């Protein structure tokens, strides 16, 4: 979707594996604010918005 109509999805009640996303190496820019990326695999979150 367009930026003004940015698509929102809710992620909850599932096990998330962020290792594959980081190690896919298909993404030119990948940064994280407030959380260290390499530790995403060891954190539990209340809800995620994509």
């Amino acid at each position: 979707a367009s930026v003004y109509a940015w698509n929102r999805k809710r992620i909850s009640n599932c096990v998330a594996d962020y290792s594959v996303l980081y190690n896919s190496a298909s993404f030119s820019t990948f940064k994280c604010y407030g959380v260290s990326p390499t530790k995403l695999n060891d954190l539990c979150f209340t809800n995620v918005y994509a």
């Binding site: 407030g34 959380v35 260290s36 390499t38 530790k39 060891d42 954190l43």
Partner: protein, 49 residues
Amino acid sequence: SALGKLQDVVNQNAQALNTLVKQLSSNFGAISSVLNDILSRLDPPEAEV
């Protein structure tokens, strides 16, 4: 309140200790007041701040 003088020092010491413990819940500008969560959620280079 016959023993007010002796109760006052006990109350003052208890209040000082209570506020000292309650100061552990303050962020002081950090993202979280807890230590272990920010240790386990940030890498050292920008967790040092």
